Amino acid sequence: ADVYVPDEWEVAREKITMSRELGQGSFGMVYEGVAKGVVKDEPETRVAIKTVNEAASMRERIEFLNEASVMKEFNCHHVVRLLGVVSQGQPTLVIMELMTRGDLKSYLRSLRPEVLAPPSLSKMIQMAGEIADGMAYLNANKFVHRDLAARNCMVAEDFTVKIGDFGMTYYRKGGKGLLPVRWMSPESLKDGVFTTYSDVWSFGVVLWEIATLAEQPYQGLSNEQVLRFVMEGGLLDKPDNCPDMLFELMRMCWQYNPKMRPSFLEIISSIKEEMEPGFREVSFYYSEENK
Ligand SMILES: Nc1ncnc2c1ncn2[C@@H]1O[C@H](COP(=O)(O)OP(=O)(O)NP(=O)(O)O)[C@@H](O)[C@H]1O
Ligand SMILES: [Mg+2]
Structure with a gap:
């Protein structure tokens, strides 16, 4: 055994x-x-x-x-x-590498107005770039996470966001336990199909988590109702004061047709300029490995 x-x-x-x-x-x-x-x-x-x-x-x-x-x-x-x-x-x-600030979800709930600044467009673009970079690396290494969510990302002392350790068991699939409906792509709910594209879908939901200081996606609806809503082309609402550009990303990661969604490399490519200076040195995107 x-x-x-x-x-x-x-x-x-x-x-x-x-x-x-x-x-x-x-x-x-x-x-x-x-x-x-x-x-x-x-x-x-x-x-x-x-x-x-x-x-x-x-x-x-x-x-x-x-x-x-x-x-x-x-x-x-x-x-x-x-x-x-x-x-x-x-x-x-x-x-394991120490991430003093805990999981992204807990970190976001921590800024909850209920006295630091919320996250600014700049801050959010950084986390998104870091998350997308770790996902592009993983996908490049033939791995489909299958359970990307704010709670599965970690925050370092210097606020660098990273993808937390995961389980595993062609494209390897991660994920362990009862997969959460609110982060699943339409095709995953419908056909049980998981791809790099459905990882991108889940990515849009964490961007939405970030933007809402971790509110519950489809809050108010049962998972059962979310199952149908999402499968029906239903999408999450634009957060109260969400930056237009940020919501743009979400909407693209949520194209019903997987092929219409951008890859993590394309996501990064489109926001790299709004990244911090150090990104070029530590990113997979700008690494020799990326090709
Ligand atoms: N690398 C890390 N840096 C800082 N804290 C961590 C780290 N890994 C785990 N923790 C903390 O330890 C507790 C358990 O975390 P958890 O992510 O549930 O790990 P687990 O034992 O692998 N189970 P799960 O991930 O749910 O399958 C939480 O309080 C975490 O914040
Ligand atoms: Mg864990």
Whole structure:
């Protein structure tokens, strides 16, 4: 059945130290801490430590390990990075790049007027560019997320937004659990079809999440009713004071016909100029890899 083969990603648990908890995960408590020599020319690094509770069986601890391993394949500045693993011995761990600000959704709800500035067009274009960049990288690497949502993106100390670690199981498909209707494309709801295009659809919804400081998409309607609405050409409303240009993107990512929607590279291409100066140096888009 299940088995985990140790590899070069292994790290000595003596190099890892946990200061405090960040939050409960699917397999157990997630902590914050420090790891030595997990980054090039970096003696120590602050990291996120995912663990599995003692109550966990072998299969679970192994499943935890094989799931975290999907991230071994990826290396993008705009995708949260795996830094190591501790499979040998009890407190099965996984060391991840630390995103001090949490998931994008929680970060957006945090600016809720209920005293910092909301996000300005400039700020939003940045997050969108970063998210689109990590998605273009992933799609370029034959992977279809299938569960892109603000809650699945993470925010770094310097406010850089990245795509959180994911699970997996031709184009590989991510996604795990009961997929949420409010982020699904019409063709996904109708035929169960997932593509780079339906990832773009979901992208438009997170732009809408951003623009609404994370309101519930199709708020007021049941998922059951959303299923039909969306399949019927129904779309989300233009947020109260949403920048025209921002809503333009949304509308294009929401073309009923998948082929009519832009790719993440085309999304980026059309907003790259409104990106920060550093983008050119860290982006997949401007990387040698993109071609
Ligand atoms: N890389 C990270 N940086 C900062 N915080 C993190 C990080 N990864 C997870 N967390 C936090 O830990 C808690 C659990 O997060 P969660 O995203 O649900 O992980 P999980 O255990 O993989 N389950 P799920 O992602 O729902 O399948 C939350 O409080 C997160 O903010
Ligand atoms: Mg998660």
